[PDB]
Amino acid sequence: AWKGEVLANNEAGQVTSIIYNPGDVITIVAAGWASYGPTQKWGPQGDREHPDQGLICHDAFCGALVMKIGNSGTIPVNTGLFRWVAPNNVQGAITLIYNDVPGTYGNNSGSFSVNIGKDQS
Amino acid sequence: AWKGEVLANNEAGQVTSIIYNPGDVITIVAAGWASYGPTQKWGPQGDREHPDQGLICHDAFCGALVMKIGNSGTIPVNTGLFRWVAPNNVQGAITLIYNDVPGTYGNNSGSFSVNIGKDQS
Amino acid sequence: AWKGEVLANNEAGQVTSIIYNPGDVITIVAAGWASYGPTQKWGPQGDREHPDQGLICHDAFCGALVMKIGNSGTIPVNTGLFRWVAPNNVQGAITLIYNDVPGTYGNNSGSFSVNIGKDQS
Amino acid sequence: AWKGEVLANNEAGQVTSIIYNPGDVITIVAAGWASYGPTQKWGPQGDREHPDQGLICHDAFCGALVMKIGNSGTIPVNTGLFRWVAPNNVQGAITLIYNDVPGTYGNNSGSFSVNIGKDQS
Ligand SMILES: [Ca+2]
Numbered sequence: 001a002w003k004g005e006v007l008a009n010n011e012a013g014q015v016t017s018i019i020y021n022p023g024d025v026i027t028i029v030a031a032g033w034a035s036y037g038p039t040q041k042w043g044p045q046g047d048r049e050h051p052d053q054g055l056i057c058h059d060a061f062c063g064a065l066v067m068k069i070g071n072s073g074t075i076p077v078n079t080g081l082f083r084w085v086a087p088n089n090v091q092g093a094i095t096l097i098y099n100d101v102p103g104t105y106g107n108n109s110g111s112f113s114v115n116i117g118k119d120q121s
Numbered sequence: 122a123w124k125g126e127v128l129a130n131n132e133a134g135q136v137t138s139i140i141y142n143p144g145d146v147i148t149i150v151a152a153g154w155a156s157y158g159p160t161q162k163w164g165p166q167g168d169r170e171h172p173d174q175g176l177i178c179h180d181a182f183c184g185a186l187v188m189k190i191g192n193s194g195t196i197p198v199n200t201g202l203f204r205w206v207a208p209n210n211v212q213g214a215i216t217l218i219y220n221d222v223p224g225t226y227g228n229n230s231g232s233f234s235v236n237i238g239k240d241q242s
Numbered sequence: 243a244w245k246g247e248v249l250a251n252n253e254a255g256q257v258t259s260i261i262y263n264p265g266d267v268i269t270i271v272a273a274g275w276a277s278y279g280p281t282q283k284w285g286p287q288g289d290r291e292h293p294d295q296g297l298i299c300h301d302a303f304c305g306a307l308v309m310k311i312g313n314s315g316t317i318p319v320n321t322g323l324f325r326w327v328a329p330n331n332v333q334g335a336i337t338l339i340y341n342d343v344p345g346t347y348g349n350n351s352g353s354f355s356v357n358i359g360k361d362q363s
Numbered sequence: 364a365w366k367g368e369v370l371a372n373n374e375a376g377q378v379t380s381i382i383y384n385p386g387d388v389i390t391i392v393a394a395g396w397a398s399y400g401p402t403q404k405w406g407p408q409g410d411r412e413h414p415d416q417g418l419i420c421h422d423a424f425c426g427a428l429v430m431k432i433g434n435s436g437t438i439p440v441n442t443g444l445f446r447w448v449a450p451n452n453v454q455g456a457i458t459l460i461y462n463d464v465p466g467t468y469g470n471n472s473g474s475f476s477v478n479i480g481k482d483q484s
Pocket residue numbers: 035036037100104105106107108
């Protein structure tokens with residue numbers, strides 16, 4: 001299992017110790033407060049009112065927690081994933097990333113606390 | 122495991138099929154958008170700027186997801202719990218509740234989607 | 243989880259720290275060598291060739307590993323149970339017992355080593 | 364998870380669908396009756412009284428259940444493995460095999476029923 005934090009200002013994301021293998025079932029729980037720039041802060045589902053101006057993940061709100069598995073496209077995580085199995089052919093290290101517009105991460109603040117574990121399978 | 126919705130305007134909360142027994146380890150993941158009155162909506166951690174005017178749970182923000190286990194007092198859930206063990210002397214059905222001031226649930230809206238499972242022990 | 247031993251000569255069995263509750267999923271793995279009297283020893287499935295002369299459990303061979311859950315009747319364990327849910331409405335402490343005829347345990351020898359855990363559910 | 368049978372006469376062993384990956388925790392439960400030649404049958408621990416005459420696994424009895432994980436040497440399984448991590452960083456597909464002397468499998472009979480699952484990690 002992996003426990004840590006995902007900084008909002010980290011454009012490269014956080015490479016975890018979890019290697020998703022075919023057949024794996026995972027659970028993720030995410031908490032905390034972060035911002036894409038404004039003085040306000042949002043939780044891991046991000047800001048529902050904010051327009052998409054070129055986000056790395058178009059299926060999640062700006063300020064949401066998202067992930068990649070190996071070299072996959074981004075997959076929304078939000079508050080977490082419960083006993084989740086990935087799409088076929090998706091495998092490798094899980095990287096967690098804050099959802100913002102490329103090149104605009106420098107003014108972000110805060111972080112999400114995240115736990116990931118493999119479940120029974 | 123249980124999957125269901127908790128409505129924000131439901132002052133009695135949503136009883137689940139999960140009975141928490143001594144020694145149990147549980148995982149909860151919660152998602153969605155709800156409000157305690159205003160046109161704005163918040164996720165399961167609720168509204169970090171809102172003052173506590175007599176909430177059912179003082180250790181969570183207004184509009185947060187909380188729970189009771191049997192006849193316990195309220196316990197914060199927020200976005201969820203990872204491989205969590207209850208305090209001693211707490212046992213019984215898990216009821217999920219939106220955190221608001223008693224008698225003020227009528228103007229709430231939206232809901233949280235919630236998964237609960239028991240883990241290895 | 244619980245690890246321990248159950249003696250072939252003990253009519254009372256071995257009370258474990260595992261309390262089986264409704265909906266629990268359990269796994270048991272059992273090993274070792276025991277006898278109900280003969281110089282030969284058998285593993286936890288017991289002696290497939292031996293007639294039932296009034297065994298405490300009629301659904302397992304003589305010299306098998308069996309259990310009770312609370313005040314239940316005996317339930318076969320044999321070499322173990324994989325991700326098992328109790329079929330009956332049973333609840334309570336797991337007691338492990340060697341399957342022999344009451345009052346004939348005096349000539350028994352050996353023991354089974356047993357691990358029990360609760361699985362995800 | 365995988366459930367299947369391992370025939371005592373199958374010198375090549377039974378390939379499962381489980382790939383053991385780094386960090387995995389597994390549980391195996393095995394049951395049934397088999398023989399390496401004699402009219403008697405034994406369970407998955409094999410025959411504790413039989414000498415080792417060149418068995419594939421010298422750390423398990425003749426007629427025991429054993430396995431290989433990828434290009435590992437043989438590893439004893441017996442009645443099973445409880446929440447087990449593979450030693451010395453071995454990895455790859457799990458193959459289940461009956462423990463007998465090479466070239467003497469032809470007179471073997473019976474089989475073991477085996478469940479394998481991955482546990483929380
Ligand atoms: Ca920004």
